[PDB]
Design a protein around this ligand. Structure first.
Ligand SMILES: *P(=O)(OC(C)C)OC(C)C
Length: 197
């Protein structure tokens, strides 16, 4: 449930039409944490299980509490891991539409990797959802070099990490409803806009 390696375990012959790459929060389990699987369930209902690949960011991404203090909200090693997953999706399945997401430190990681991506690949990312975006205030609510209309930020009232401080209050732990509904909904809508039916 909390670990999905569909891209890593996939190949060109079985390519899905949609590939979702997701980065968990600090200290979360597996490579999807608490929010990732909910998004996944929704995606799988919309596209079939065969029509979508779910991939969490693992490897060098350890989701360390200390890394949040680094200049871009995570280590440069984690940034290289996620960037490498986008490259792999492009290599294995050039025809697939990409979608991404991240929670807390994972939101900073998602933003950093996307900012750094080759524009050709970044163009294929139809939508990105961020929850408890630690760099929300600093990045004025968006991802550098990526279109705003493609980005959706979920920041609860009272979630201090959205207002510039690294302080965890209960609202930061309350994104389950968003992950279960409006987040995957937005993603499906963007993929449908670039693919149709
Ligand atoms: P994020 O990495 O979130 C986890 C606590 C879930 O937290 C920062 C604000 C320390």
């Amino acid at each position: 449930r909390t670990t999905r390696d569909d891209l890593i375990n996939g190949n060109s012959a079985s390519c899905a039409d949609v590939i979702f790459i997701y980065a968990r929060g600090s200290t979360e389990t597996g490579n999807l944490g608490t929010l990732g699987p909910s998004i996944a369930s929704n995606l799988e209902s919309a596209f079939g299980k065969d029509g979508v690949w779910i991939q969490g960011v693992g490897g060098a991404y350890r989701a360390t509490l200390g890394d949040n203090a680094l200049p871009r909200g995570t280590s440069s090693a984690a940034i290289r891991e996620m960037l490498g997953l986008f490259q792999q999706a492009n290599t294995k399945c050039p025809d697939a539409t990409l979608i991404a997401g991240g929670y807390s430190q994972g939101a900073a990681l998602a933003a950093a990797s996307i900012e750094d991506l080759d524009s050709a690949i970044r163009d294929k990312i139809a939508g990105t959802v961020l929850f408890g975006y630690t760099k929300n205030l600093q990045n004025r609510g968006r991802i550098p070099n990526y279109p705003a209309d493609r980005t959706k930020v979920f920041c609860n009232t009272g979630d201090l990490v959205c207002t510039g401080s690294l302080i965890v209050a209960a609202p930061h732990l309350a994104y389950g409803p968003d992950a279960r509904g409006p987040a995957p909904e937005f993603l499906i809508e963007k993929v449908r806009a670039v693919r149709g039916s």
